[PDB]
């Protein structure tokens, strides 16, 4: 058996399941960096406003092209002018690129190791591919980076803690920003005011001798190749979502929803048009442009527009998630972690909604890290994961008929040490409460697929509600965990309900 439960064909997906969007318009909780009156299918969006406006403060991104981005001369010079000068040089050897990046990053001249960049260019690529890199790709990237003040003309607010706020921008604006991140031009983000933000500059991508660095680089250059050659025409929305009230889980009278569970397939392919879970670090993107190459990092590499979330998304608190709609997949891959390789360029065939966003919605929810395995059965811990997932799944002011299924898997398992069987149930309950069906990918674990199916069907047949199940979870803690383990969760739940 390759899958179990409800056929995946019967689950809701976008755009089919969706109601029409309201007119796109800027407001106090929605930043829109393009001319909405001029947004048309197949046309590159026009930036709004027309001319660059700069803000340099603690509420907005600090743009490398700011008049306030200054450097020591002791007189004070325009660092943006320095950046233009440094990057407009001919590169024919990797050291030239390292030298260029360090011209406006002088304090990091010893700290920043560029070994992986040098090794990629010199010891991985063949002569012809190296030539395409320095004659065509890098110069095109520089040019898109340097167009920044003409492309990203509107200040970008930080999505700070507790904010419920969205930023909608064009793929083209994202590409200019990421190109700057590659050349490490973002001021004040190196080493401080941004200790609660992820890194954005790509300096850590260039360090060390991990065998996975070449595969990261190929993945990113495939993106850069494509977006600098032919500007993408769509939009991407980033939404920071906070909930103020969470359910009384013990009393929740909601029934369980449907489940499709399978040990084959992937969220990104088989989960088309569904709410796709990213097993996030609380610093979104995790190790994407350093070391780290599991689920989050892979998705951020194949859909690089996700990476720009790190420019403006503060670390997630327990009640928060980040929702990103409209990122495009640019690469295919195989393997995972130390076996991960870039395979080929991907032509994303996703339809676009009425805001010209690809019909791909990804939610970043960060699981807890458990030092000790039994820590996660503590009720405070279970409740936290339930509320985290619920926040990720809930769409206030949307009726269930218009909500796609959630496509997820073994959230928080592996390095963070979650129990897959407990996490499955927790996601099932959260999705039930948010009135969404669940499509669960076990990634090769056939035994886990049958176990999740069997538990779900068992509880559905017995008409147990979210509350009934949560109460069993608390019983497990109180009877089997706190005085220690002895009996596993699912066996406990079967015997407990059978009586």
Characterise this structure.
- There is one protein chain.
- This protein is of the alpha/beta class.
- It has one domain (1-499).
- It is 34% helix and 13% strand.
- It has helices at 79-87, 94-103, 115-124, 127-146, 148-151, 171-182, 213-229, 267-270, 295-302, 309-312, 379-393, 420-433, 446-461, 466-481, 489-497; strands at residues 3-5, 30-32, 70-72, 76-78, 165-170, 235-242, 259-262, 275-280, 320-325, 331-334, 341-345, 361-366, 406-409, 438-441.
- The chain has a ten-stranded mixed β-sheet, sandwiched between helices. The chain has a two-stranded antiparallel ribbon with strand order 3-4. A two-stranded antiparallel sheet has the order 10-11.
- A hairpin with a 3-residue loop joins strand 3 (70-72) and strand 4.
- Belongs to the poly(ADP-ribose) glycohydrolase family.
- It comes from Homo sapiens (Human).
- Keywords: Acetylation, Cytoplasm, DNA damage, Hydrolase, Mitochondrion, Nucleus, Phosphoprotein.
Write a brief structural summary.
One of its GO terms (biological process) is carbohydrate metabolic process. With 499 residues, the chain is of the alpha/beta class.
| Biggest sheet architecture | 10 strands, mixed
Q: How many structural domains can be distinguished in the coordinates?
A: 1
Which structural class do you get from the secondary structure elements? alpha/beta
Shape: globular
Rg over C-alpha atoms, rounded to the nearest angstrom: 24 Å
Q: Work out the helix count.
A: 15
Estimate the strand proportion: 5-15%
How many β-strands, per DSSP? Answer: 14
**What is the straight-line distance between the termini?**
31 Å
Strand order in the largest sheet? 1-7-14-13-8-12-9-6-5-2
Q: What is the string of SSEs from the N terminus onward?
A: EEEEHHHHHEHHEEHEHHEEEEHEHEHHH
**What portion of residues is helical?**
25-40%
